[PDB]
Amino acid sequence: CKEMMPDIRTIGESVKAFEDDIKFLSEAIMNEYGHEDYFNNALLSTLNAVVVEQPQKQAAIALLTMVVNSKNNVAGKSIINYFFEELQKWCKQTYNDEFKSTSNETGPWNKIKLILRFLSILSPMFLVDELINIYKSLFELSIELNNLDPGNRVPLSEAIYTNTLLNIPYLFFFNRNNDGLRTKVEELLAYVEQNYLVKTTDINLLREYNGEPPYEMVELVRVVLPNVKKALINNLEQLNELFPDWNHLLTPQTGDEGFNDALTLPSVDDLKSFVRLNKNFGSVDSMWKTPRYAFHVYLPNSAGNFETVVPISTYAGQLFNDIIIDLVESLEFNRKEVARQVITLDLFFKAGIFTEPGESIAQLIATYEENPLAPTFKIEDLAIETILGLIFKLPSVSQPFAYFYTLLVDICQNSPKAIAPVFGRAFRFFYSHLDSLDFELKLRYLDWFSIQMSNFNFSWKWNEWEDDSIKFGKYFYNPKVNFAKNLIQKELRLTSNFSEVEDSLPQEFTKYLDTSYIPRDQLINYYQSLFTGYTVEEDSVRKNDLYFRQEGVPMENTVRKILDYTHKANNSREVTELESILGELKNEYGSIISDFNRFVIILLVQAVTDSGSRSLSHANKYINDLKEDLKTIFAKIELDIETKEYIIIEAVLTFWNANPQTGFLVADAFKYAGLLTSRTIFTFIFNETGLKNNGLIEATAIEAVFRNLSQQISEENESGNNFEFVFERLCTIANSTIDLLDVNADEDIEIPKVNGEMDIDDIEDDKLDLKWKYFTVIGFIKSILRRYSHEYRELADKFIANIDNAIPHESTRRTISNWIQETKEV
Amino acid sequence: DTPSRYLLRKARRNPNGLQELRESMKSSTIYVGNLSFYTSEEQIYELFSKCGTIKRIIMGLDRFKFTPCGFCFIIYSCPDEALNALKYLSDTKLDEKTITIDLDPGFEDGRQFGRGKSGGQVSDELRFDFDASRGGFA
Amino acid sequence: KDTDPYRTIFIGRLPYDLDEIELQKYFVKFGEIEKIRIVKDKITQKSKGYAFIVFKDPISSKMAFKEIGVHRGIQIKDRICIVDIERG
């Protein structure tokens, strides 16, 4: 049981012949195939498991199945029968709510795409005539939208078209039904040109770079079809891409198989007349995994000293990219083992680029190194290309963001002779093409390049960025100088000193540095501080906002009283005594307590944060010891609550405007302790005072918005999970405790309940589009479209009717409404 | 298997060795070690936020001078974000130093103070090697 | 209290009547030396038999340790002086 499974999950990685390892394993398994009573039932499930979760070794597992089918035709019938049912499992239960209805990772249809790729790869074990028969029924799902299912979703028709079209790189070259394959190609070409012209709205949301030069971010349906046409123009003989094991050197000499003698002998079974389970309404099935763009920045002459290139419009490009991406998906959690199958891919990739840790224990990132892709293929570009296209993958990465950094940091602890230069070249190219890259990917490249510099010693070629930092007239809002400013700010909070980042950059590049996070107190000794740093018509580098001048500012005499009663260890009752004198500093000025006391709120927050400005822990301790005053000076029942909670955040922003790291944790601390609301932080990050930091486009401000929304989703998720766990507990406290949790789940959902913000920048004749309020605000609507696909889907009754189609019908401008449509067309 | 019972740690462990193994595998806390003596909590906040929203941090302090002594305790909200910080925020640089991040079994007062007989870490009492951001020849 | 400690090799059990010049000639064979300092007893300047040898680079220092330390002791004058790292 646990011996045949390790044997079936080691084959392909040894030191002897792979032909000898597959032939020997077939005889042992057939010895274990003491017909089904002993161990075939274990062998069938383990083989099917290897052909669902190990797609990179599809050719390896197909030969052993062919070797088993040659020894036992009854086992070849039984394996194909169970594989079709598991395909029927993975296609009908493609819905991840069958991880609820069956509590098993039976689910998303990409597994079924690897299932149908295997059966297409097993074309010598199972009848080719039946393969084209199931290929017709997949293509007929596109024609279901004509008459058989006249309202089905474009993603359902795409993923049946794409499963056939991605199977093409293994055994489209089977000329028996050549007349039938042309008719299948004509149906699909008509369906690709109909649907994806009419549904081109999705592609503008998911484009990594919206520029034709040097490479175009083609849609996946329109990229694989040119790759299929290029293969068809090459007589279907795909070459230098597959390391197949099933037509050679026992009949031939060439190099594919040691098994094609025996392979032609066995019977080929039919495929049981497969019909794809009809899509139900999109609430209990039909998850319909979204369309995608094709990231490409590498080509020929990006290297001109290695064996050239797989073309963009080639099956060899798609096969190597799919094999790399499915391999990193197999060992992602172990970066030293994620290295060990991401580039050396093997069949059998012999140790050019030896590999990481430089221990060469994982000497299995070694590529070119000659050819799993049968000639020579330079995967060292393609490995960096495939890991970039996942971290930049709209709408969200296939893995955690930082895991790409640690893998690439392993992949420089790898062969430095070759892999470090190519990563530097790809970094330069992405920087040059920053002018049309998505703001989602721009923030992703900002975080990645700063953290990669933070693993080295900030040893960058800064003067190679002189396009935007020596031609400084290319105004700062432009993406190139703006990225370098945000990278230096991100590298400032990682070098842990301002002055460390300031020395590392050139004197020219010092203008786009990160500036002086030191506090700004409005109740400081501002007569002497008029001399020290009130240059005021100079020193505009945003180091401080000390808008006092002297004694004479309102409640200055109570601030100094509150300052002396923030040292010496005063108390919460004593702080209320000092609060009463600032209440008395509003009676005079004409409101006897003013009942929300924004002026008193300005005085307390300025003194307390100044007295805590020595560490993030000191502000955290100060916000805890004075939380009862901060709750009463936020306020109590409704939006007199919000009016000073905003003014608490306004005063905290004015004190910490030079310190984006401190304010982000401060906005996090007020939300968690209930000293502010997520609704109040949302309106604060649309306020006029925050519009002029760098914009709404400031990277920390988008980070503050996103981490606030994720905590609300985390508080909703934690409440719902305690509900079901108490529902599991036989409904005892679940009349009460689920109801309080579903109210807490309807508190972070019905105050996820956004309102209109993009309803007037289209009412003047200004460029709403492509200014700093669509660079942010439409890329942030895209960032509200991305990563919150679920949250949009669950509010879709309120989202369509109440939140889109009051303004964002044809009543709103078509610029705003396009991004709403682009999230619908996903 | 590398993130595991970091043996000969948890000296003066209040519970039994089984309860030292219990709740460590479901902890949301990771004791960062070997960090620089001038590294700050704000730098630790930066690095640890790459694998989720931190909920608390506790710098490791000398038991006799209260300065940072080359260790830390990071506290994640969810253990799934902490396990990401195990695989993806160990084995890297934090103020150009080793940042080894053993998921020790939970915070307790007194554990934030070094257990060395000179005040620092017990690791620091036996390392004569010149490491400038660890005091020097310790 | 000379330069960076990984460049400073420790050689001990050096001969009692030796000279700093012939100690310099021995240690220079594995790389350029930056400074030398034979240690003498501060209470009265008997040659203590140990010395400090600063090489220009730590890769050059570790070759002198490898070569003249693992070979039973560096044959100086009439003594076998084993060599290692500074250890301080």
Rg (CA), chain B: 14
The 10 Å Cβ neighbour count of residue B132 is: 12
d(CA A640, CA A125): 74
d(CA A485, CA B68): 31
From A487, A615, A786, A707, select the one nearest B54 (Cα to Cα). A707
Contact (Cβ atoms closer than 8 angstroms) between residue A112 and residue A87 = yes
d(CA A581, CA A558): 7
d(CA A59, CA A481): 48
H/E stretch holding A35: none
**Non-local CB neighbours of B13 within 8 Å, separated by 6+ positions:** B20
Q: Which two tokens stand for residue A626?
A: 């004075």
Task: Please answer yes or no on whether B130 and C6 come within 8 Å at the CB atom.
Answer: yes
Chains C and A touch (3+ CB pairs under 8 A): no
Min Cα–Cα distance to chain B from C6, Å: 8
Question: What strands, in cross-sheet order, belong to the sheet with B29-33?
Answer: B29-33, B68-76, B54-61
With CA atoms as reference, the chain B residue closest to C4 would be B130
Contact (Cβ atoms closer than 8 angstroms) between residue A180 and residue A134 = no
d(CA A262, CA A266): 7
Q: Is some CB atom of chain B closer than 8 A to the CB atom of C1?
A: no
Residues A434-454: b if buried by 16+ CB within 10 A, e if exposed: beebbbbbbbbbbbbbbbbbb
Task: Please answer yes or no on whether C4 and B137 come within 8 Å at the CB atom.
Answer: no
C88 contacts in B (CB within 8 Å)? 128, 137
Contact (Cβ atoms closer than 8 angstroms) between residue B71 and residue B122 = no
B129 contacts in C (CB within 8 Å)? 5
Whether B43 has a binding-site annotation, put simply, is no
Q: Is some CB atom of chain B closer than 8 A to the CB atom of A665?
A: yes
With CA atoms as reference, the chain C residue closest to B132 would be C4
Where does residue B66 fall: left (phi above 0), alpha (psi -120 to 50 degrees), or beta otherwise?
Answer: left
d(CA A804, CA A365): 48
Q: Nearest by CB to A616, which of B42, B50, B77?
A: B42
Min Cα–Cα distance to chain B from C84, Å: 13
Chains that touch A (3 or more CB pairs under 8 A): B
Q: Nearest by CB to A402, which of B38, B89, B93?
A: B89
From C18, C21, C3, C20, select the one nearest C86 (Cα to Cα). C3
Q: Which two tokens stand for residue C67?
A: 């070569």
Maximum Cα–Cα distance for chain A, whole Å? 102
With CA atoms as reference, the chain B residue closest to C88 would be B128
How many angstroms separate the Cα of C69 from the Cα of each of A237, B130, C14? 65, 22, 12
Whether B104 has a binding-site annotation, put simply, is yes
Q: What angle do CA A404, A409, A411 make, to 5 degrees?
A: 90
Contact (Cβ atoms closer than 8 angstroms) between residue B70 and residue B121 = yes
The 10 Å Cβ neighbour count of residue A726 is: 18
Residues of chain B in Cβ contact (below 8 Å) with chain C? 128-130, 137
d(CA A739, CA A745): 9
Min Cα–Cα distance to chain C from B126, Å: 11
Task: Please answer yes or no on whether B92 and A668 come within 8 Å at the CB atom.
Answer: no
H/E stretch holding A513: none
Q: Which two tokens stand for residue A76?
A: 């070849």
C4 contacts in B (CB within 8 Å)? 130
Contact (Cβ atoms closer than 8 angstroms) between residue B123 and residue B102 = no
d(CA A398, CA A439): 18
Task: Please answer yes or no on whether B87 and A334 come within 8 Å at the CB atom.
Answer: yes
Question: What strands, in cross-sheet order, belong to the sheet with C33-40?
Answer: C33-40, C47-55, C8-11, C83-85
Terminal Cα-to-Cα distance of chain C (whole angstroms): 11
Q: Which two tokens stand for residue A7?
A: 């044997």
Beta strands at C74-76 and C47-55: parallel, antiparallel or unpaired: unpaired
Torsion of CA A819, A822, A823, A825, to 10 degrees: 160
Look up tokens 């003013």; give the residue.
Answer: A594
Min Cα–Cα distance to chain A from B78, Å: 10
Task: Please answer yes or no on whether C4 and B130 come within 8 Å at the CB atom.
Answer: yes
For residue A582, with 0-12 CB atoms within 10 Å meaning exposed, 13-18 middle and 19 or more buried, which class applies? buried
d(CA A97, CA A80): 27
Task: Please answer yes or no on whether B137 and C88 come within 8 Å at the CB atom.
Answer: yes
Contact (Cβ atoms closer than 8 angstroms) between residue A620 and residue A669 = yes
Whether B100 has a binding-site annotation, put simply, is yes
DSSP characters over A66-123: HHHHHH-HHHHHHHHHHHHHHHHHHHHTTSTTHHHHS-SS---THHHHHHHHHHHHTT
Q: Is some CB atom of chain B closer than 8 A to the CB atom of C5?
A: yes
Whether B73 has a binding-site annotation, put simply, is no
d(CA A368, CA A428): 23
Task: Please answer yes or no on whether B130 and C87 come within 8 Å at the CB atom.
Answer: no
Domain extent for B80: 1-138
Instruction: Kindly tell me the sign of the dihedral angle through the C-alpha atoms of A576, A579, A580, A583.
Output: negative
Task: Please answer yes or no on whether B128 and C87 come within 8 Å at the CB atom.
Answer: yes
H/E stretch holding A756: none
DSSP characters over A423-436: HHHHHHHHHHTGGG
Task: Please answer yes or no on whether B93 and A455 come within 8 Å at the CB atom.
Answer: yes
A300 secondary structure, DSSP code: T
Amino acid at A409: V
**Non-local CB neighbours of B69 within 8 Å, separated by 6+ positions:** B37, B60, B61, B62, B114, B116, B119, B120, B121, B124
Task: Please answer yes or no on whether B128 and C6 come within 8 Å at the CB atom.
Answer: no
With CA atoms as reference, the chain A residue closest to B59 would be A617
Q: Nearest by CB to A406, which of B40, B57, B91?
A: B91
A126 has which bridge partners? A269
From C21, C62, C26, C25, select the one nearest C38 (Cα to Cα). C21
Which alpha helices (DSSP H) does A260-415 contain, by range? 260-263, 315-331, 335-338, 379-391, 401-413
Look up tokens 């084993």; give the residue.
Answer: C82
Which alpha helices (DSSP H) does A122-219 contain, by range? 128-143, 154-167, 178-198, 201-206
How many angstroms separate the Cα of A88 from the Cα of each of A123, A140, A272, C14? 19, 17, 12, 82
Whether B114 has a binding-site annotation, put simply, is yes
d(CA A800, CA A821): 10
DSSP characters over A200-231: THHHHHH-SB---SS----BHHHHHHHHHHHH
Break chain C into its structural domains and give their ranges. Answer: 5-84
Q: Is some CB atom of chain B closer than 8 A to the CB atom of A451?
A: yes
Beta strands at C83-85 and C8-11: parallel, antiparallel or unpaired: antiparallel
The 10 Å Cβ neighbour count of residue A796 is: 13
H/E stretch holding A236: none
Q: What is the CATH number of the domain that holds B108?
A: 3.30.70.330
Min Cα–Cα distance to chain B from C78, Å: 32
Q: Which two tokens stand for residue B51?
A: 């694998």
Q: Is some CB atom of chain B closer than 8 A to the CB atom of A687?
A: no
Q: What angle do CA A334, B123, B58 make, to 5 degrees?
A: 70
With CA atoms as reference, the chain B residue closest to C6 would be B130
d(CA A485, CA A476): 9
From B137, A261, A115, A686, select the one nearest C5 (Cα to Cα). B137
d(CA B96, CA C70): 33
CATH of C5-84, one of 3.40.630.30, 3.30.70.330, 3.20.20.80, 3.40.50.880: 3.30.70.330
Domain count, chain B: 1
How many angstroms separate the Cα of A484 from the Cα of each of A497, A513, A587, A726, A806? 17, 9, 50, 50, 40
